[PDB]
Amino acid sequence: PQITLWKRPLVTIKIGGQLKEALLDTGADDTIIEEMSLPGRWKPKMVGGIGGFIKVRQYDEIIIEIAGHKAIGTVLVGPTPINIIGRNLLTQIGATLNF
Amino acid sequence: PQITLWKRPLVTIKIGGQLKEALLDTGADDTIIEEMSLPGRWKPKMVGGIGGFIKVRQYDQIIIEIAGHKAIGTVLVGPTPINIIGRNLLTQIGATLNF
Ligand SMILES: CC(C)CN(C[C@@H](O)[C@H](Cc1ccccc1)NC(=O)O[C@H]1CCOC1)S(=O)(=O)c1ccc(N)cc1
């Protein structure tokens, strides 16, 4: 699809067997999802931006379906105020910014 | 242009005759730039990011060029990790997300 930016570019995703809403975010280097259980090992990471940093769990090799497009990569899990699909997975679904 | 997302989508902007670098951020509702002088009056604004909400200065009807496209609109000035062009000005320059 072509998504305009009059409103937040929210899409449905499937992760961990769960349907969620997430923001398509070209300003985010990596994908971050609100607290949930994911399989496998993880390591701690700090991510920050406006208002400072938060501590997250980094899970690798996670499959996520994004508006019907499947893609695999690292997913961070932590107390994000919104679910964010960052560049590490946007590239996999062929997302571009056009103007 | 068509901008892929393998690297951060950084572009040149011009504000007040000065060139700066900024991030095209579909996840940002608002445009926020690092401390600088802008003309006119400002109003208070609370901006929410990954770490919480912070106080910034809101300037309206500011002329800004973004990768050679003209925009005139609201610019926030505050503690940001990088200059961010958000949806308020991305819409003006006709940017869309495509996949
Ligand atoms: C600040 C930019 C450079 C980076 N962030 C992405 C931004 O899109 C971020 C996304 C977001 C939306 C709403 C609430 C919370 C976060 N929007 C943001 O702050 O909007 C502010 C700035 C003006 O408008 C409002 S991040 O969330 O800190 C982050 C960093 C690292 C990764 N791996 C993932 C996310």
From TrEMBL, chains A, B:
CDD domains: HIV_retropepsin_like (cd05482). It comes from the Viruses. It is found in: Host endosome, Host multivesicular body; Virion membrane. Residues 20-89 form the Peptidase A2 domain. GO terms for cellular component: host multivesicular body; virion membrane. GO terms for biological process: proteolysis. It is a lipid-anchor. Signal peptide: none annotated. The keyword Glycosyltransferase does not apply. Keywords: Aspartyl protease, Host endosome, Hydrolase, Protease. This is Protease. The lineage of its organism: Viruses, Riboviria, Pararnavirae, Artverviricota, Revtraviricetes.
